[PDB]
Amino acid sequence: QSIDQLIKARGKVYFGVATDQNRLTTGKNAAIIKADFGMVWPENSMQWDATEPSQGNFNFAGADYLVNWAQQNGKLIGAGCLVWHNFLPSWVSSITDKNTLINVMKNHITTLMTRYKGKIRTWDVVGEAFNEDGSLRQNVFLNVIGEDYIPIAFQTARAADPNAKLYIMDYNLDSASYPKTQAIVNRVKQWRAAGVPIDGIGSQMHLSAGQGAGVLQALPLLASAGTPEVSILMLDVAGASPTDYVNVVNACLNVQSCVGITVMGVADPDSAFASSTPLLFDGNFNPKPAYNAIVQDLQ
Ligand SMILES: O=[N+]([O-])c1ccc2nn[nH]c2c1
């Protein structure tokens, strides 16, 4: 049974997965994505180090492969991350002039979003912008541009492709009492009050065992910021307990504005955390107990 087909029948948009060319051409990834998933994100091929390895000079081959495969197979596309501290080339990190970094960041956003204009359902525009205490993370953008970098990124993105849903995403938003969870909500409210076009908050749910239960309180807290959408991103759970995975899926079902769920990969050996067996398919590409538990929960 297809978890994407089932979640759509419950009124959600998709069950998605991160992938890229050389997963699509190996294992049983393409077959499983075709049957069971409704949306794909490039895991790496849209990040800054992959797409703009030197200033103004873009590399599209990998991202084009993913986008084309998705279109050929009738899948929605999410992509990102346009602005975050991960996967950031040293040429960007070196920049000290505010105007220069604003131009660099806007060129990066506009070039990527223009190439794929109208093809991308969801763009993760800003990622990992918060410290664990809820203050803004002192990455190169904050240090050089200041906190306006976030409004500028979103306004630039909206102009480049008005059709895309624009998200901010972060991790450790899994507990409703944690300061980071509270802070992203409070700041997204403020930005949206200033007219900043933040359509979504995405929660990067890289979970430890037993953390599914807390998401039942954290996800509605995230939704209280008033964005039209929220999403679950990068989902994996150490041990892949059915209870953890079902709690996450039910949090999605409970939150009206939660459009869907993206898992970090298909099969355990292809996880960055393979020892923790944290995905829904095993190393022979067979569905695990958590996959079947989600099926039953959604039926
Ligand atoms: O949900 N995802 O797995 C995922 C993976 C990589 C990303 N880059 N930007 N947004 C992403 C979402």
Curated annotation (Swiss-Prot):
Q: Name the Pfam families for this protein.
A: Glyco_hydro_10 (PF00331)
> Any idea where the GH10 domain is?
1-297
The reply on keyword Membrane is no
The catalytic activity of this protein is classed by the Enzyme Commission as 3.2.1.8
Please list the GO terms describing molecular function: endo-1,4-beta-xylanase activity
- Catalytic activity from the UniProt record: Endohydrolysis of (1->4)-beta-D-xylosidic linkages in xylans
Q: Which keywords does this chain's UniProt record carry?
A: Carbohydrate metabolism, Disulfide bond, Glycosidase, Hydrolase, Polysaccharide degradation, Pyrrolidone carboxylic acid, Signal, Xylan degradation
Active site (catalytic residues) = E128, M234
Per the record, the GO terms for biological process are: xylan catabolic process
> Does the record's keyword annotation contain Chaperone?
no
Q: Which cysteines does the record link by disulfide bonds? A: C252-C258
Which family does this protein fall into?
A: Belongs to the glycosyl hydrolase 10 (cellulase F) family.
List the PANTHER family.
Answer: ENDO-1,4-BETA-XYLANASE C, GLYCOSYL HYDROLASE
The entry's protein name is Endo-1,4-beta-xylanase
Organism source for this protein?
Thermoascus aurantiacus
